[model samples]
Target chain A: GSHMMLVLITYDVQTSSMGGTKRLRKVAKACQNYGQRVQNSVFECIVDSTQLTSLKLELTSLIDEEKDSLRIYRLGNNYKTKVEHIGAKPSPLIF
Target chain B: GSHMMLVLITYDVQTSSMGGTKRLRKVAKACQNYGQRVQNSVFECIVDSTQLTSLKLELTSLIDEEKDSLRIYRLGNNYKTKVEHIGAKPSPLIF
Candidate 1:
């Protein structure tokens, strides 16, 4: 089974003057040690629930205490399951 | 400026046995009258806001009344603006 992993981090700012380009660079630098940047402010990281806790802790530390607010979402796997049934041999001697 | 337009429709069903293939086909046919099918259950239609209102009305009439639920979302323009300043001419053409 293949899983789609995603992390969505939203930041609310007290000051609207913060530059989007600069903020994105800062976020990219912070996550550079852990994951690959996928889109603007989006990252693709290895799927490990425990890794997310550490990632969030590291991300929060990067935030500027003066004017930025942060929130993070880690999405788990989307799975499709399959089941199959096969006939069993009743008597090995018959074969 | 270019706008990214999107419409998302979600439906809840009372019965779980309803076939996804059949349901999606029906919805595609319904949308065919107004828009081009982009992907499974996703359609692309270019229009002004007025046309969107009309499109929604048409879609509402297509769903099964008894065992289905429907919700629609339409997202409009994502814009980035640029500002420019023109320099004023000197007070006199002395040169």
Candidate 2:
């Protein structure tokens, strides 16, 4: 249990202009590599703290800071109690 | 400090078929009622437990379980330390 923590990651990429759509897709792909997608652009990532840092770095490097947004929530290890889900049951592998 | 807690809410509504688009918009609108929109389909809500319950109830009623998904992360009252943001700074009112 000490080995992993749950982090909620959400990103918004401004796709109204050039290359923005690609950036959005790439950011989603990066998140997919590390966790399960729970929403259109949101992910529930279970990782060690170091792994989280790596994921954060990869995500940050891919987005345009002035035009995009990324928010990360550190939910600690006992996330089962802190997280609530409603509608459309998620993939069993991640939960 | 004890009165308010930060919660992250994310939802995905299937819009490939009838009425799904409207449901998606309604869900987003419901979220806007209680929190700051941080990304498309994601919001950061700060509220007491009761307020959270209300928000959850309203959101749950708006979507089709078979075609949608909603996930909430209760980030506790001390959310400043637990949350990290990168790219496109959010409004000062929420953070």
Candidate 3:
């Protein structure tokens, strides 16, 4: 059985140069395939361990080690209690 | 004793208008006062229950609910294991 968890993925891709700007768009598009964009540069992904591994690998390859920052948070199954939101809500994820 | 824990805060402020841009800066600054900016608009805050309450109140008042979104993730004291990072790290927070 797939043990689903909520993963919060975020990044700061230095967009000073053209290459960096392209990477930023690529990274963001990749994340969009995995989950909902709750904010600019942030995604809330509901995935299992295997899916997470794949997502991490893709993101790791997309970023420039010295120029970008990526942070992933595992919210486990009890993510509802762990997350609080206010104001505008993002649209629901579509199939 | 202050029961300290790590709180991850992130926001998306609509910057289509000048007022929204100013609100974005103000919200980011408020988060800085409480924690370290891990990404462009993400902060990792080490705060206790009381501090969290105060931070939430300030943020709530600063954002325009109709146009903005704020998310607060309670990482608890064991946040270290819950968070994973890659690429360039943010500089240390200074008083």
Predicted candidate 2 versus true structure: per-residue lDDT over A1-95, tens digit per residue: 67887788887754444677688678878888888876666787888878888999999999888777888887745634777778786441132
- Report fnat in order of the candidates: 0.00, 0.85, 0.81
DockQ of 1: 0.03
Off by over 4 Å in 2: A1-3, A14-21, A89-95, B1-4, B13-25, B64-67, B77-79, B89-95
> DockQ of each candidate's interface versus the true one?
0.03, 0.53, 0.55
Q: Name every residue pair that clashes in candidate 3.
A: none
For all the candidates, what are their Cα RMSDs to the real structure?
A: 22.1, 7.2, 6.6
Alpha-carbon lDDT of model 2: 0.76
- Arranged by DockQ, best first: 3, 2, 1
Q: Candidate 2 chain B, which ten residues in sequence have the lowest lDDT sum?
A: B86-95
> After superposing candidate 1, which stretches have Cα over 4 Å from the reference?
A1-5, A11-23, A79-95, B1-95
**True contact recovery of candidate 2:** 0.85
lDDT of all the models against the reference? Answer: 0.45, 0.76, 0.78
Candidate number of the best TM-score? 3
Candidate 3: segments with Cα more than 4 A from true spot: A14-24, A79-81, A89-95, B1-4, B14-25, B76-80, B90-95
lDDT string for model 3 (B1-95, tens) is 35887788887754545777688778878888877777766788888888899999999999889877889988645623777889897542235
- RMSD to native, candidate 3: 6.6
Q: Quote model 3's TM-score.
A: 0.72
Q: What C-alpha lDDT, on a 0 to 100 scale, does residue B17 get in candidate 1?
A: 40
